[PDB]
């Protein structure tokens, strides 16, 4: 009896802009926005994710959560793909792009209820984004000289470890910066050849001990056992290593060469045949001067027995990804065939031994000041495997953070912990009053949308929101005898753990975010926020 208007399409559901889908889309995103509000910051919260495979994990990072969540609704998919856009090109800012673009839509609703057109809302953010990106170039304080010093790496890595794993910040900083300095070569004024691969730093973890027992070695570390009867090599430097793609066994013919059995007389000759040939092959290989054979394939029983009499360390590496990085260290090259270890194909390694880590013995691969290595490994130790795995995720994001320091002006930095946020708000309001027209309403709301980051750090830390907000405003608003406002821009949002009062200077704890991450996060989050406002209707149809 009661008719229905607005839907002529196949009994589907399509929200017209007159029904306020944009307000409904922001409300659906607000549910996801509140998830990240308890994430960012060292005081943030961890979320338990129960996988469909029956595995329970817990992580702070929201980008890992979005991958474990099934995203369908179109307004949410925009920020998920925008989060993946933040995941590429940098290893930090996952919680930054989600909270920022979420608040830009929150303040946009107050303009929609006012009646301000969505196109005039997008035009306001685009003009305010260019004002922000231009101002952030002048808001830079220091710049990393790319000296590659350990102390210079401690300045960048320390704030990256924060907001993910807290309390391990100073302990993991010495472990990460040591392995990075091993991969970073010694050069200056050369920007043509890129370097510092992420895969160049391997992270292994063994249960037992604590972070105090964790060390840093130069080389790859393998979990597999020393299959051969030789547990470790001598202390003499530069041992030759041969990488074999072919398994260790009697050689075959490139044409056919299929083993067939007819009479028992042939079976007795097959055993003695493989006995004499393998003994002849392993001999000549060991006679070439190579004391370590890395086999990418299986190892025969007789082939392993003869190499044990010659004192040859046998270590099997079935993973081809580890053999590629092994070539960048020892210098050896994989041979598809077997029996011809050319000395030009042979590499050199100083020390190959087997060490007991966490109670289990593993054969490592390393060096001391020779046959330089482009690959390093971090050995982590801990009692809880769960939290120890989250340490590996914080280190991998710290390695990607060092990759953020490169030629495209990565060394530029800005004070973090809400110090730049509050200062940028007052600088955008300076642009608001100077820009006439209706843009003033959108520019001011664009600056208010940056209040979510400082309020987030104060809310998750247990601090009083009503007390911290004016302390941030009164600190960055001062009266100076001149145009430039002088001594102290360093007042941030203070995460205490202590008792008494107030905010702190960024120079005290040296906790800051680089300009490359913050400038890229704002440009992507604003473009993603203006994108959601561009869709006033969605239509689903059969493919």
């Amino acid at each position: 009896q009661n008719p229905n208007a607005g839907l002529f399409k196949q009994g589907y559901n399509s929200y017209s802009n007159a029904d306020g889908q944009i307000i409904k889309s922001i409300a659906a995103i607000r549910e996801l926005h509140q998830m990240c509000l308890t994430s960012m910051g060292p005081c943030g919260r961890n979320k338990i994710i129960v996988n469909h495979l029956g595995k329970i994990i817990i992580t702070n990072d929201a980008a890992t959560m979005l991958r474990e969540l099934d995203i369908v609704h179109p307004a949410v998919k925009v920020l998920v793909m925008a989060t993946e856009q933040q995941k590429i090109d940098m290893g930090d800012g996952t919680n930054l792009v989600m909270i920022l673009a979420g608040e830009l839509l929150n303040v946009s609703e107050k303009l929609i209820s006012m009646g301000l057109s969505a196109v005039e809302i997008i035009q306001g953010y685009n003009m305010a984004r260019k004002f922000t990106l231009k101002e952030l170039d002048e808001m830079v304080v220091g710049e990393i000289t790319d000296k590659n010093d350990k102390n210079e790496l401690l300045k960048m890595i320390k704030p990256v470890i924060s907001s993910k794993k807290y309390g391990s910040e100073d302990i993991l900083s010495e472990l990460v910066s040591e392995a990075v300095s091993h991969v970073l070569p010694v050069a200056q004024q050369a920007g043509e050849i890129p370097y510092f691969n992420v895969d160049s730093i391997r992270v292994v973890k063994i249960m037992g001990g604590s972070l105090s027992n964790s060390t840093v070695i130069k080389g790859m570390v393998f979990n597999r056992e020393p299959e051969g009867h030789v547990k470790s090599l001598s202390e003499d430097k530069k041992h030759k290593v041969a990488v074999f793609t072919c398994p260790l066994d009697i050689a075959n013919t490139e044409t056919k060469g299929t083993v067939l059995l007819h009479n028992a007389q042939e079976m007795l000759d097959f055993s003695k045949g493989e006995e004499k040939q393998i003994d002849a092959m392993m001999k000549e290989i060991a006679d070439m001067g190579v004391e370590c054979i890395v086999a990418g394939a299986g190892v025969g029983e007789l082939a392993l027995h003869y190499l044990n009499r010659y004192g040859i360390l046998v270590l099997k590496v079935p993973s081809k990804f580890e053999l590629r990085r092994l070539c960048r260290v020892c210098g050896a090259t994989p041979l598809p065939r077997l029996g011809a270890p050319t000395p030009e194909e042979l590499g050199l390694v100083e020390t190959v031994k087997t060490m007991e880590i966490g109670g289990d013995r593993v054969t490592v691969f390393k060096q001391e000041q020779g046959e330089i290595s482009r690959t390093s490994t971090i050995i982590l130790r801990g009692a809880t495997q769960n939290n120890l795995d989250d340490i590996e995720r914080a280190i991998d994001d710290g390695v990607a953070a060092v990759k953020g320091l490169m030629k495209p002006s990565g060394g530029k930095l800005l004070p973090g912990a809400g110090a730049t946020e509050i200062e940028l708000i007052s600088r955008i309001t300076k642009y608001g009053e100077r820009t006439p027209g209706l843009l003033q309403l959108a520019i001011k709301q664009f600056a208010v949308a940056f209040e979510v980051v400082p309020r987030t750090l104060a809310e998750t830390a247990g601090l009083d929101v009503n007390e911290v907000l004016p302390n941030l405003y009164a600190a960055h608003n001062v009266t100076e005898p001149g145009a430039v406002k002088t001594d102290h821009l360093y007042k941030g949002v203070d995460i205490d753990g202590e008792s008494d009062e107030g905010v702190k200077d960024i120079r005290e704890e040296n906790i800051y975010d680089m300009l490359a991450t913050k400038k890229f996060a704002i440009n992507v989050a604003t473009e993603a926020a203006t994108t959601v406002l561009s869709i006033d209707q969605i239509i689903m149809a059969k493919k």
Partner: protein, 534 residues
Amino acid sequence: LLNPKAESLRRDAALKVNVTSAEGLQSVLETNLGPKGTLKMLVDGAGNIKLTKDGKVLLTEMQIQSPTAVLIARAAAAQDEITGDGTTTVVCLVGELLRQAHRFIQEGVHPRIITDGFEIARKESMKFLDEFKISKTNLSNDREFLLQVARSSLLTKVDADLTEVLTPIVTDAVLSVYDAQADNLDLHMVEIMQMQHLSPKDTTFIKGLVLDHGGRHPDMPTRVKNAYVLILNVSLEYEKTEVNSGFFYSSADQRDKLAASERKFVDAKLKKIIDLKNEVCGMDPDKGFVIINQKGIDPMSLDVFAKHNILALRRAKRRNMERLQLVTGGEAQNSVEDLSPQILGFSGLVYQETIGEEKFTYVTENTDPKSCTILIKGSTHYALAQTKDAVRDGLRAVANVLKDKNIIPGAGAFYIALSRYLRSANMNKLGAKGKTKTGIEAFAEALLVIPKTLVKNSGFDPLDVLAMVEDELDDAQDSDETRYVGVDLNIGDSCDPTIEGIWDSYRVLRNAITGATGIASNLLLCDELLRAGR
């Protein structure tokens, strides 16, 4: 009057439903009209997101149960096959023309007089179309004017920040493939290829051709200022004997002898290739040699070619090998035995852009390439789809300017003037009919939908901006001169569309008025809506 399993809409309520159904589609598609419009999102249910403001691309991806909108979707399909742009504009013209006629339908006016009044006004619209149109010179030095045509096409489908990026790309794409001395152009010569892992503002124009698979070796040269290009069909990798045989080696050194003896057939062809580089301009500076060779190349030949500093490509698409014949000019060499320096082509700077996941090879700076490439960059999939839709619509819009020498000013200059013309003309002419005056006046009032919609998506008052234009037209008419007036969407006042650089194609507006009139008339000609099997 019924049988089993039948439904019929008979009286005038049938036409009221068809118009109302068309009025529902109008309200949906009027939001994306113009550069101030909105960007609609589509979901196929499998998780694919597509962002486009084009009318047909939306209508083809949506399934419509309403039979009236299906005819509009079929009509918008013929508009892209002819005009290629303005499918949304046709929808806005059909719907409002039915709404304005619906007012007269309730008055008791028969639809024939309504449809005949639209055909008479369409004939007068074509007469005004020839007088209002502007004849643009065929000169190719008009790029300054082409910068205005590019903005008219780009500003609709982009945020207007990608306009400055895509304006030199699209404009250089059309004129480069455009043949001199007033010949035609081929849009197929401009290749559109999408890539990931870079921002959309980094989109650049490629004068030559780009290839996917690059040379894999650490010592390959980064850039070569000038090089001689070789197109080879011969496999440079390890091969096998043409007849069945086998390699039986007593020792490991004998196996290398049998392997080198078989590669010697390839090595004999390899020596002829490397010696040809020293044969022509070997010691000469600003000279090089590149191997685009189609079939595979073993790492043994890659090490030899690296010592000579020769770029070696392998595993190339068969279609791209034929494109290099036009772009580079070098002929395809089927056999190295017949290889000669006259077969090789010449190219300009060839530099390999190295990204970790993807390696790029640039054939650009060619003497007579006659083929362009537009490399579209984006991080996500929807960023590539929105830009590609702007490029495909941007290349055809500029192509219609060189093909059709007639141009029309945009910003509603043709719509507002023709609406004012037909209203004042029929009163002075009076040569149609007395009852036709309703159909003529309804069509003139239906032409105002576009200038009212452009300011509706902009948010400005449509009544205020229309009165300012009517005051300027009346002042220009009393001044006895020719002044083209249009609506400025940014400021909100009027503007001269010739100075502001907002231009619409002649073929787009010619088939829009004729197309929208014929489709909207056929909907009014429907007496009864029959439904069978429902």
